[PDB]
């Protein structure tokens, strides 16, 4: 097969998988979403140039212009190849989102149990910061589900150059505010 000919499907999938693996579960990854309807790719079709859209969305556009919405190059309905493979990566991600939503609920609910205890000699760990060992003043949550203090961590990441225990690259934009833990 000709090397100068590009298979965009295997290329797209590979890059989409990476993006999904690197993506915070609160964030919906770009190339799992339709450029036109902004939602999850649910009936994905792919163009000869390699662009992916939900079928209903790209066809709706083709009623107006017969060009690709990203390249402005000629595009018609017969150039739209079915790309059902991508759905495997989409479902893989919504699974991550679901699991991530379980993690928050578990943290919240035993933080509610811990809060109703009186006369502890030790503050419950659900309320303590792992790298501050004090009361979490401003609750903040990782993508895996560990809870820090927004600035006990911010100063920590600044100190060691966006790294943390466990030795892993973390940024304070990889982290979402999580007031619901005390709520």
């Amino acid at each position: 097969r000709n090397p100068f000919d590009i298979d965009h499907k295997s290329k797209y999938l590979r890059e989409a998988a990476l993006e999904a693996n690197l993506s915070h579960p609160e964030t919906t990854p770009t190339m799992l979403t339709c450029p036109i309807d902004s939602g999850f790719l649910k009936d994905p079709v792919i163009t000869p140039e390699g662009f992916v859209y939900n079928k209903s969305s790209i066809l709706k556009w083709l009623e107006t212009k017969k060009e690709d919405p990203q390249s402005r190059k000629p595009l018609t309905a017969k150039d739209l190849q079915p790309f059902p493979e991508l759905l495997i990566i989409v479902n893989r991600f919504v699974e991550t989102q679901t699991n991530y939503e379980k993690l928050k609920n578990r943290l919240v609910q035993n933080a509610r149990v811990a809060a109703r205890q009186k006369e502890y000699t030790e503050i419950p760990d659900i309320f303590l910061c792992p790298i501050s060992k004090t009361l979490i003043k401003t609750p903040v949550i990782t993508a895996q589900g560990k809870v820090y203090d927004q600035e006990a961590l911010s100063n920590f990441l600044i100190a060691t150059g966006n790294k943390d225990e466990t030795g892993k690259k973390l940024s304070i934009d990889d982290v979402v505010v999580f007031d619901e833990l005390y709520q």
């Binding site: 450029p35 309807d37 902004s38 969305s57 709706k60 556009w61 990203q70």
Partner: protein, 148 residues
């Protein structure tokens, strides 16, 4: 859905990655009626001037372009006294892949580099092509007068 669906998505994108010389968002509920803020580019006569924009999304967004106009008075060959902006992507060259954030960037660079051969104020266009010093002088003074 689909318009409302996308508008909400575009709003949330500007909650993490707000445009550097821009600032958008809705006036209030309604969500189809936004108001944005762009800054005057450096080395342009609009430097150090905050300009206000009104944004109306059509019902069949994003298959039709948003209606965008300057609320702030500005001196420019592609912007008239009413705020109407002469820009191809707000018209026939609109694409459903474009976002409001990209529209603002286009508008921003239009301020930096006008298109006099596409005049909406033919008199300012003339001055811009036969006398830049005059053009720059005036636009800079309008900026002082009307831009925040």
């Amino acid at each position: 859905g689909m318009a409302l669906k996308r508008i909400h998505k575009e709003l949330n994108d500007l909650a993490r990655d707000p445009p550097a010389q821009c600032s958008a968002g809705p006036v209030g509920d309604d969500m189809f009626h936004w108001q944005a803020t762009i800054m005057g580019p450096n080395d342009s006569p609009y430097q150090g001037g905050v300009f206000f924009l009104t944004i109306h999304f059509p019902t069949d967004y994003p298959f039709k372009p948003p209606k965008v106009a300057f609320t702030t008075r500005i001196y420019h060959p592609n912007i008239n006294s009413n705020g109407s902006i002469s820009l191809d992507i707000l018209r026939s060259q609109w694409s459903p892949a474009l976002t409001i954030s990209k529209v603002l960037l286009s508008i921003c660079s239009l301020l930096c580099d006008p298109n006099p051969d596409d005049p909406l104020v033919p008199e300012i266009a003339r001055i811009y092509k036969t006398d830049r010093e005059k053009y720059n002088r005036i636009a800079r003074e309008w900026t002082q007068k009307y831009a925040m």
